[PDB]
Structures are given as structure tokens and as C-alpha cells.
Subunit: 263 residues, 4 copies
């Protein structure tokens, strides 16, 4: 399409924010898959539905008979896309733990990160495998101080820490939201330098507010259908726009590092 | 300022709104013109290009100009004018009145249309005391220089001037108010993200130009500008630094009319 | 080609600082050539021997019968590589201008920039063509304040301003040195992001000091033979290193903008 | 000092490369000091004299009766400034281990990083404390692949990993040379943006080559006495130049992260 006049072009990227989220959640899910080495489980409990928790739970359905997503926010059941996954709010979980025997997972995954699940609640399980997502990205004193990932690695015969970074680029956290935003912002800066570009728009907003303040998952999902970037230019930049975004998405590297505990 | 996903993370929306950035930029352009005019009074001022800075620049000319007329190829842009003292004419109505009338004979002509805008031929039909042409070019870009014809538009007026707007020490592709606002926001984000404890920084941007020229909805566009320029997720307070970074980037904008002497 | 151990490689760029200087001076000389449209001159006077002036004077020898380089520093005669170019210091030029008739150029080119040639000295000529190099690059208030390029365009039937920028990149001035330094620095940042790179070294120093403080052109020319960049990496980066540098050299765009009457 | 004419000022930074090196080696030595909690040792063995190793060995003399620096390069004995530090080449250490009993350290520190000490040689010791310097900085696939820091933490009752990063900035390694170079380069970017600056020169060269190819420590030490940055500007920037460098040096954060065997 054209801009203000036919002398300027407007190009909306084919890559949408949801395609960026998808690629990142998938890398996290594949990092977990690789660490699990094809092991099968009777009951998997995943803490934290947003943002990568939903796909990671879907990915566990193949080798896990029962997959339970647990979240402190009951409205996050709406972020699950597959009915095979069971959703439990934190109160219902804690209630069932005390007055029941149905909760005894062999796989526990903590994806809550900063200010999330307490090591105390994790200590109530005895799984074969414990995976804790490390929210820390590149160095930041403020984030390191509030982080307690090591304290959460208190159960499981096998323990692992899910780490996610961008090769050659700086990111403050390993969070899917942070990574998507950083991939978009870095692509923007390089796209603006392409010949004939007037300006580059990253189609961003505080998406996290839609999910946790407005409590509207449906609206949040609609907001992710937006082109990641919109560019105003004199010449065609469509090909270079997709290449810069794809290259930045490809920088994402996710892996589970085994936390050695001999006893 | 509010909590994010949990009480361990804060969300800070900047006090500075996108409209405050737009306002500061348009005002710098209007003051650059004011300074160049040296208090000279005019009977009829014609301003080509209502969007984005033309609206305020026309309002600023009302003091020393008896009649101020905004001319735009888009008739719906009459909605971007905020003062009823500014007369609005579409390009057809102007061209018609020029041929079959004598009411159009301005002593002050201002072309703010930039890229793919007013033709030097239409400018040649006037004989003002002062001609000011806004140069859309920012920092060097071959694609933009090729399409630019600012020098060809400086064909009339006893006194000629070129309105130039740049960001001191920073790169911008154009002098456009939209380009500058976007670049100020993006550069502020880059620096804000480096503050200690910041997780991620969101520039609240979108293709605002599309709302004005594709959707043809000025009202919606104006509402979209009321949004905070930046939203930050952090562990610690960044509210004061967030405003300081933005203010410093807004201050980098330098607008001036360079006299194009001729005899 | 190994570093501290055989597990790390050291790669010195094939492109030398002199190759970057050469490419930038040639772009400036070609910008002037295109503006002159093949016009022939009897006497060309070029103010400012360092850094592009030397090559620009050499490039004028084809269409100019006499080419004179003028400079406030007499030792800069050493930066001229062709004996066909005549060298005069600023004092000798001013003396001859006042008490003589041998100086009456039809082509005047001012390349001194910041704190250089006075509009008063330029006003003493009546050439067919005048070219003033604009030292300003991208926007900077401090540099704009001290700049007086417009005041120097006071003579010549045809006037032009030599402008040089880097497309899509920020540079404070249009000066050859600054452009070489900025090309090197920007290449280094992108090279550091290549996979397996540990660190990237721009082989820079205050080269200007060797020329104007130490007053040693020979040493300065030897200093330019160094590789522009040295990289420590686990994997091969030879070709990417040359591609990033070449792309940054290619961003340089020089042109003479005609100043009407 | 002036430049080409008196209209331009040349400013050489008061901060020398050696001062930036000093701040980085000292932070590493203080990170180790803090981790050791004042514990005293009979024999400390430090692998890798260059670059931070020499000062780290000097810092251990207070609480260690015997401090031995071990290096694969015999000429690196020249980088040690204090005669109290005993120097042994790699061959001499391995020979004495097999045909002797004088080598039985209670403190082992591996600072060799990439392509350095083999876990096999580390396995030959039985110290009270083992500290392995992690050479990895922020994420890079190539560097992570060649890194084997975890495999080197095979001995010691107490294990620690010395990590060094730049808060909010990207660095490929934790190496003293990499950090100094990155601090200088980042300071240049910001210094170049100061008003009136024409250009900024980082006074860098391949210093590592002087030490390992030319095998001249003396020359290397002389090369570090140079000002870190030289700036050409119209106005005074002395105070800002030192402030930008100091702020970048301050971003360096070194710490030993404990690895608990719990056995
Ligand atoms: N104690 C707790 N128990 C269960 N869920 C929690 C929790 N504390 C926070 N959460 C939930 O966990 C999520 C924290 S955000 C996690 C981001 C995720 N690691 C990613 O990279 O996408 C939110 O859905 C929040 O509501
Ligand atoms: N030939 C013409 N005559 C009158 N108005 C025109 C025109 N071509 C474009 N325009 C109008 O001029 C504007 C071009 S956008 C101008 C951007 C402006 N310089 C700024 O910095 O804000 C739009 O309002 C457009 O509709
Ligand atoms: N008044 C004057 N007359 C003649 N030469 C001068 C002068 N003032 C300065 N110079 C010389 O002009 C040069 C200024 S350096 C300018 C940089 C050059 N435009 C480039 O891009 O390479 C120096 O060689 C200096 O000795
Ligand atoms: N197997 C080995 N045994 C002992 N020293 C070694 C070694 N391999 C390399 N070295 C030495 O250890 C140093 C590796 S350089 C590591 C850089 C250091 N971590 C810093 O940040 O300053 C060099 O001096 C090298 O000669
Ligand atoms: C990673 C992360 C987290 O674990 C908790 C929180 O509140 N915010 C983030 C940032 C993000 O979601 O990207
Ligand atoms: C400057 C400018 C212009 O003159 C014409 C156009 O279509 N777009 C822009 C960019 C902008 O408005 O910022
Ligand atoms: C451009 C320029 C100049 O006009 C005068 C001076 O002294 N230094 C420079 C910088 C440079 O040589 O690049
Ligand atoms: C850290 C490091 C290392 O462990 C091995 C090597 O060859 N180079 C470096 C880089 C540096 O010294 O910064």
C-alpha cells in the first residue's frame, strides 16, 4: 500500500507478533523435550500459564498421560488452546494437596519466574524430574537480587534449569514477552537503516496489561495478530523487512541445563 | 505506576504522552518560522499541508496574519484544525479560485507537504513577500534525496527560506514530525531499557498515519496520541529517569529556517 | 593466525586503513570531477593538502594546466605524491597575491573546513568555478555554530558545495578522517555480533597528531598500512569481516551541490 | 592541546587503558576474596597468569603461605610484579606432580578459560576450595560450544565459578581484555554524541599479540600507559569524557557463584 501520497509506500510485515511468540514458545518447549529424553510421565504439573506455559503444556501431552496447568490467576484458563490440558487455580491446587491424593506429579515445571511460586510449595512435591525456568537474561543487578531460581531447585531426582537468551544481543530476562519485544526493537533499528526508509514502527503495546489488568485473554490474542512492524519508505523494503525479523527470531537459543545433585 | 504480573514487578507508564512530543516538535517548527519572519505582518498567509505540524503552524500565524488559509489535497483534514480562525480550502477549490478569482494573492506562502507534495508549478503561480518551503530530508539517505525536490519549489518570494529540523547528535531519516516523534521514542527506549532493574520497555507506537490517511479519522488519531509514550516493566522505581530520558531526547530537536538568498 | 592458544583465531582484515582513506578521497575527487563536467582550466588553486586535497589535486592535473595546493603548514608539501602539483604555503600565496599577477585562478577549491580559509582571502579571487567543502556532517549545534561555509561562497560564476555523508549512519563531520574512523567503528560493532567472535579491535590512534603535532607525514602514511580491524574468534570470520567493512565503505556518498548565483 | 588549528581541541583521557585494566583485575580479585571469607591456605595454585591472574596471585599472598602461578607460556613469569609469587610452567608442574610431593594445594584457581586447563589435570588435585573462571560473557553459541567450565568443577570441598559481566551491556566473554575493549568502545559511542565532538578515537590495538606472539610483556605494559580515548572537539569535554568512561568501568560486576556438592 501507499502512505500519505503515492510517492511513499507503507509495508506491514508478514511476520506477526503471534508468529514471534510462537517461535519462542516452541524453542522453550523443544528445550524441555530434549532434556526429558523421551521419558514418559503419569502426571505433569506446569506452574504459570502465561506466556510460554500454554504451548509447553500442549507439548507434554504426547509423553504425559495427564498434564495440569496451575496459575494463581483463574481467568488464565482462557489462554489454554487444547482441552486435553487440565487447569487448576493455585487455591484449588493447594486445597487438593492437603485434602486429597490425586496430586502426586512425576514431572513438575515451574515457569512463573520473578515473584512466582515459592520454594515451599515446590518442596511439597516428589517428582522424578523438576525443571525451573530461570527468568534472568543478561546481567542486571536488580533482577539478580530478586531472583531465587536456585532456591526453587529443592525436589526431583533429576533437576534442570530452563535458560533462554539471544545470541549476540542483550536481553534483561528470558521471558517470552521480553524476548519478543527485544527482537522487534532490534529489527526496527536495523530496518530504519535500509535505504529509502522514512520511519519504522514497532507495533507494540503493554500486552501484559491486557492479560493481567484488563483480564482479557481473547483481546490479548487479537492484539498479537498485528504485523510486528510497519514501515514507511520510498522503495520496496518488504524482503529485507522479513529477513531482518527472521534473523532476530533465529538468535533465540533455549536450553535446559542439568543442575547436578548427587544426593 | 502499578504492579505487573505480581507485586514483585512494577509497570510505569510515562507521564509524557505521544501528543506532548508531537506538540513540542510542532511548536519548535512554528517558533523557527516565527523567528525567520522577524515580526513581519501579512494580509494573507497560505499554508500547504495540514498534517502534522501545519495545524499548529497555521494557528501560530494568526497573530501577525490577518487571514490564514490551510490548503490540503485531503478535504477531511479540515478536522485536524483546532482553531476556527484558520480558513480551510481543498486543493481543487484553491486551484479553481486561482483561475476564476482574485481573492487568492498571498504575501506569505508556506509549503509543509514535503515528499511527493506540492508541485513547483503551483508554487510558481504565487508572488509573495516571503516563501518558506519545509525540507523533508533529515540525515543522509540516497532514496529520500532522489525523490526530494525542495530546491525546485523555492521559485517565488522576495525572501526565501527552507525550514529544516534535525535531532542534534542522532540519526533521523526525515524532518517529519511523525518521524521525529517515533525516533525520539525509540531512542528513549534504548536508554530506558539499560536502567537497572528494567525487564523490558515498550514504545506505545502504531501506524498513526494510517488512522489519518487510510481510515480518514482525525478524531481517532488524536485519541491515539493521548497514550503514554512509553510503558516500562521493572523491579525498582524508574519513573523519574523515564521522564528525564524522554525530555532529553525531545530537547535534541532543533528546528530552523535557513535563508535561501536570491537577487 | 592463532591467539593465546590454538582454540582461538586471530584475523587481521585485508582492508587496511589506507584503503578506506583511498576510497573516501576518490569519492570526493569523483564528486568534484562530475560537477566540473569536463571543463578545462589554466590554473586551479586547492586550499587544504590534508587529507583528501592531495588526491583531489592529482585528479585535477588532467583538465588543469597548473594545479596549486595551498596550505598553512609548509611541511604538508610531503603529503603530495605527484611532482606536477605545485605547493605554496599560505604566507607565500598571500604575498604573491598582493605583489604579483601570477595568481589568477579560474578554479578555486577550499577543503580546509573548520577554522580554515577566511572568506576575505576567497574574496580576492575571480574564478569561473568555486568549490567549498562543507565540513558539517549530521546535526551538531557546536559544529554548526563554528561553521561559516556559506560566507566562503562569495566568488565564482558557478558555485558548488562539496558534501560527504554516510547513507543511514551518523557522522559529525564530512572530513575524511572522521569518515574512516566512523566506518571502522561501525564495522567493529557489527563484526562483534558475528557468531564465535570474542572481541573486535579497531586499529586506531590519533593519526592527525602524527601529521600536525609530530609533523611527520612519512610516519602517518606508514601508520595507515595497518589492517583496519583485528578480531579474536573461535571460527573463521575473514570474509564476513571484509564484507562488513566494504558495506560500510560503500555508505559514503560524496557530491557537489550547485549554489545558484 | 589543539588539533589541526586552534579552532579544534584535542583531549586525551586522564583514564589510561592500564587504569581500566586495574579496575577489572581488582574486581575479579575482590570477588575471589569475598568468596574465600578470610580462609587461610598453605598452598594456592593459580592457572593462567594473563591477564587478571598476576594481580589475583598478588591478592592471595595475604592469606596464602605459598602462591604458585602456573602457565603454559614460560615467558609469562615477566607479567608477575611481586617476587613472592612462585612461577612454574605447565611441564614443570606436571613433572613435579608425578615425581614429587611438594604440590598438594588447598586452594586451586583456574583462570585459563577457553582452550585452557584440562579437567583431567584439575582432577589430580584435592583442595579445600576450587574456583574456575567462567570465560563466557553474554550469549554466543560458538563460545558456549567450546566452553567446558562445568566439566572443570570436578574437585574441592567448596566449589565456585568466577563470573564477570557488564550490567546492561553486551560482552562476549568475561576476559579482562574483552571487557576493557568493550568499555572503551561503548564509551566512544556515547562520547561521540556529546555536543561539538568531531570524532572519537579509542586507543586500541591487538595487545594480546604483544604478549603471546611477540612474547614481550614489558612492551605490552608500556602499551597500556596510553590514554584510553582521544577526542577532537570544538568545546571542552574533559569532565564528560572521564564521567562516561568511569560509568562504563563501574558497570563491571564480578562475583563467585558457589557450586554446592553437599557431600
Ligand atoms: N505462585 C504462583 N503459582 C502459580 N502461578 C503463578 C504464581 N505466581 C505467578 N504465577 C503466574 O505465572 C506467570 C508469571 S509470568 C511467566 C512468564 C513465562 N516464564 C514466560 O517466559 O512466558 C503468570 O501467568 C502468573 O499469573
Ligand atoms: N499537492 C498537495 N497540495 C496540498 N496538500 C498536500 C499535497 N500533497 C500532500 N499534501 C498534504 O500535505 C501533508 C503531507 S505530510 C507533511 C508532513 C509535515 N512536513 C510534518 O512534518 O508534519 C498531508 O496533510 C497531505 O494530505
Ligand atoms: N587558512 C588556511 N589556509 C590554507 N590551509 C589551511 C588553512 N587553515 C587550515 N589549513 C589546512 O587545511 C587542512 C584542514 S583539514 C580539513 C579536512 C579535509 N577537508 C578532509 O576531509 O580531508 C589542514 O591540512 C590545514 O593545514
Ligand atoms: N593448559 C594450560 N595450563 C596453564 N595455563 C594455560 C593453559 N592454557 C592456557 N594457559 C594460559 O592461561 C591464560 C589464558 S587467557 C584467559 C584470560 C583470563 N581469564 C583473563 O580474563 O584475563 C594465558 O596466559 C595462557 O598462556
Ligand atoms: C520473565 C518474567 C517473569 O518471570 C515474571 C514477570 O513478572 N515478568 C517477566 C518478563 C516477561 O514476561 O518477559
Ligand atoms: C516528512 C514526510 C513527508 O514530507 C511526506 C510523507 O509522506 N511522509 C513524511 C514522513 C513523516 O511524516 O514523518
Ligand atoms: C572536518 C574537519 C575539519 O574541517 C577541520 C578539522 O580540524 N578537523 C576535521 C575532522 C577531520 O579531519 O575529519
Ligand atoms: C577470556 C579468554 C580466554 O579464556 C581465552 C582466550 O583465548 N581469549 C579470551 C579473551 C580475552 O582475553 O578477553
Amino acid at each position: 500500500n501507499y502512505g500519505i501520497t503515492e510517492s511513499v509506500k507503507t509495508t506491514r510485515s508478514k511476520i506477526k507478533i503471534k508468529d514471534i511468540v510462537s517461535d519462542v514458545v516452541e524453542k522453550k518447549a523443544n528445550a524441555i523435550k530434549y532434556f526429558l529424553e523421551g521419558e514418559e510421565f503419569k502426571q505433569a504439573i506446569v506452574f504459570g500459564a502465561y506466556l510460554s506455559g500454554s504451548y509447553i503444556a500442549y507439548s507434554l501431552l504426547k509423553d504425559c498421560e495427564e498434564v495440569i496447568i496451575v496459575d494463581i490467576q483463574p481467568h488464565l484458563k482462557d489462554i489454554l488452546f487444547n482441552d486435553g490440558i487440565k487447569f487448576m487455580d493455585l487455591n484449588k491446587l493447594q486445597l487438593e494437596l492437603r485434602n486429597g491424593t490425586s496430586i502426586n506429579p512425576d514431572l513438575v515445571i515451574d515457569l512463573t519466574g520473578i515473584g512466582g511460586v515459592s520454594p515451599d510449595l515446590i518442596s511439597k512435591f516428589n517428582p522424578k524430574v523438576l525443571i525451573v525456568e530461570d527468568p534472568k537474561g543478561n546481567h542486571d543487578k536488580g533482577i539478580s537480587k530478586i531472583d531465587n531460581t536456585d532456591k526453587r531447585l529443592c525436589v526431583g531426582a533429576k533437576k534442570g534449569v530452563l535458560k533462554t537468551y539471544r545470541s549476540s544481543k542483550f536481553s534483561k530476562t528470558s521471558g517470552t514477552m521480553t524476548l519478543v519485544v527485544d527482537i522487534i526493537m532490534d529489527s526496527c533499528r536495523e530496518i530504519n537503516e535500509l535505504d529509502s526508509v522514512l520511519y519504522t514502527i514497532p507495533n507494540l503495546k503493554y500486552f501484559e496489561g491486557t492479560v493481567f489488568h484488563e483480564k482479557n485473554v481473547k483481546k490479548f490474542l487479537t492484539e498479537l495478530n498485528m504485523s510486528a512492524i510497519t514501515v514507511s519508505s520510498i522503495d520496496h523494503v518488504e524482503y529485507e523487512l522479513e529477513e531482518i525479523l527472521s534473523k532476530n527470531i533465529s538468535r533465540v537459543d533455549s536450553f535446559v541445563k542439568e543442575f547436578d545433585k548427587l544426593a
